[PDB]
Amino acid sequence: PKRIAVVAPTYAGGLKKLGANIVAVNQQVDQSKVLKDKFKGVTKIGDGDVEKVAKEKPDLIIVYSTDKDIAAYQAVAPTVVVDYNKHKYLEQQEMLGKIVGKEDKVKAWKKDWEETTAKDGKEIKKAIGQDATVSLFDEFDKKLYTYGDNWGRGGEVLYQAFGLKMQPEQQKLTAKAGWAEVKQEEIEKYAGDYIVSTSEGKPTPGYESTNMWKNLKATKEGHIVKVDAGTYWYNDPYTLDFMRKDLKEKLIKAAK
Ligand SMILES: [Zn+2]
Ligand SMILES: [Zn+2]
Ligand SMILES: [Zn+2]
Ligand SMILES: [Zn+2]
Ligand SMILES: [Zn+2]
Ligand SMILES: [Zn+2]
Ligand SMILES: [Zn+2]
Ligand SMILES: [Zn+2]
Ligand SMILES: [Zn+2]
Ligand SMILES: [Zn+2]
Ligand SMILES: [Zn+2]
Ligand SMILES: [Zn+2]
Ligand SMILES: [Zn+2]
Ligand SMILES: [Zn+2]
């Protein structure tokens, strides 16, 4: 029952899934309608909350490689420092399987996940077309963002699992960093056949009100797929299975 403090929110759902003794978890899991329920009764910390982490007495601390309080956590407990960029969503769960020694439980999760989504992918393409493209549009702080195949927002399900085709210019732009800000008037340039927009529940965003948005072919064909932003930030086994179910139905229904 080794006590883990998960400061980096990327790896919270993957450890919970494997049954880790998470005694502390990043506050930001509360934004996910999948993960909030999984972590009720678990202490919420934010960045800088070293004593909040310390007080729950962790045997292990998990932080990002860009976390500034690493030396502070090193004084509290053994700190596993994780470079996000180093592993993709499946390899990332393999790593968490090592942390808790459930490496064989992950190999079975991976196999079933890959089987189901590949088979899902053949089905999705049957409705929308083999080379039908999907775009990612995400607003935060009134800025517009798009992503590669491994930066949340459904990308790892859409492009890796399902094998759907990524919008040609979105792929070029995000090939470098995995993410990129989009000029609200170059939005037509990155729009694809289908659009995943993280504006579910959100008041009609600035980019969903422009006349260029109303004139996109995806909008015209009713191919806008709206999803909750906070829920779609993640790429954990809990989130993955939800997005799998959610994206499949919303895309197929969009296909008339
Ligand atoms: Zn806090
Ligand atoms: Zn202990
Ligand atoms: Zn951190
Ligand atoms: Zn790693
Ligand atoms: Zn790196
Ligand atoms: Zn592997
Ligand atoms: Zn192992
Ligand atoms: Zn089926
Ligand atoms: Zn083709
Ligand atoms: Zn906003
Ligand atoms: Zn601001
Ligand atoms: Zn890819
Ligand atoms: Zn079309
Ligand atoms: Zn939703």
Side-chain angles (χ1 to χ4, degrees):
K2 304 170 188 188
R3 315 168 53 82
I4 313 185
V6 195
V7 186
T10 306
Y11 320 100
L15 290 167
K16 181 69 192 177
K17 178 76 171 188
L18 290 173
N21 190 3
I22 299 176
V23 298
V25 69
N26 199 283
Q27 58 181 350
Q28 285 167 330
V29 296
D30 279 354
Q31 306 276 4
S32 175
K33 303 188 165 186
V34 175
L35 289 184
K36 177 191 171 180
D37 203 39
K38 319 270 178 181
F39 293 107
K40 51 187 176 191
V42 182
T43 305
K44 311 298 173 184
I45 80 252
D47 256 34
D49 290 12
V50 181
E51 278 292 332
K52 272 219 196 169
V53 172
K55 291 165 68 55
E56 282 294 313
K57 296 163 193 179
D59 293 342
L60 190 51
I61 308 173
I62 315 281
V63 294
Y64 291 123
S65 62
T66 66
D67 203 84
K68 272 201 154 193
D69 309 290
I70 286 178
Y73 293 120
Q74 281 176 335
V76 178
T79 293
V80 169
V81 186
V82 181
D83 189 351
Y84 179 75
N85 290 332
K86 186 125 303 216
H87 311 92
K88 282 193 166 187
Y89 83 116
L90 289 182
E91 215 180 340
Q92 166 186 300
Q93 184 63 19
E94 288 181 349
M95 299 301 274
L96 301 185
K98 288 178 174 157
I99 294 182
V100 299
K102 293 196 177 193
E103 218 169 330
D104 291 347
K105 189 184 176 172
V106 181
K107 297 163 187 174
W109 169 84
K110 185 182 173 158
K111 184 183 184 179
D112 180 41
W113 162 259
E114 289 197 286
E115 275 194 346
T116 305
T117 50
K119 290 175 196 70
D120 284 346
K122 274 152 186 156
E123 272 183 358
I124 296 182
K125 286 174 179 167
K126 277 173 200 161
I128 75 171
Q130 295 292 315
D131 303 314
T133 68
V134 183
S135 301
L136 287 179
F137 286 121
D138 177 42
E139 177 265 337
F140 183 79
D141 226 19
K142 296 174 187 177
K143 292 171 216 155
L144 185 64
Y145 297 100
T146 195
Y147 306 97
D149 64 352
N150 209 108
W151 214 267
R153 291 78 178 179
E156 34 274 294
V157 186
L158 290 172
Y159 310 127
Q160 302 187 60
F162 291 158
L164 301 187
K165 189 181 171 187
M166 167 160 6
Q167 205 272 350
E169 283 292 338
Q170 162 179 336
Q171 186 164 15
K172 292 179 200 167
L173 186 62
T174 63
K176 161 62 189 168
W179 67 274
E181 185 187 317
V182 176
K183 315 170 187 184
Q184 210 150 290
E185 292 226 353
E186 285 193 8
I187 186 182
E188 208 180 306
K189 178 187 183 186
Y190 298 97
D193 296 314
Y194 295 79
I195 300 176
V196 174
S197 182
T198 66
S199 68
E200 176 177 310
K202 216 195 276 177
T204 302
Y207 73 90
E208 282 195 2
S209 61
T210 70
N211 297 322
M212 180 159 22
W213 176 271
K214 304 173 184 167
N215 285 290
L216 297 175
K217 113 163 200 162
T219 312
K220 295 291 195 179
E221 287 182 5
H223 290 356
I224 310 297
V225 174
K226 294 178 185 197
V227 297
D228 184 70
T231 314
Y232 272 64
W233 290 344
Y234 297 87
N235 52 14
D236 58 78
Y238 286 139
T239 306
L240 288 180
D241 210 25
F242 176 79
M243 298 180 300
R244 184 202 143 254
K245 285 175 287 172
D246 197 51
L247 290 170
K248 184 195 199 176
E249 155 189 5
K250 287 187 186 161
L251 284 170
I252 289 182
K253 282 184 189 179
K256 279 186 164 179

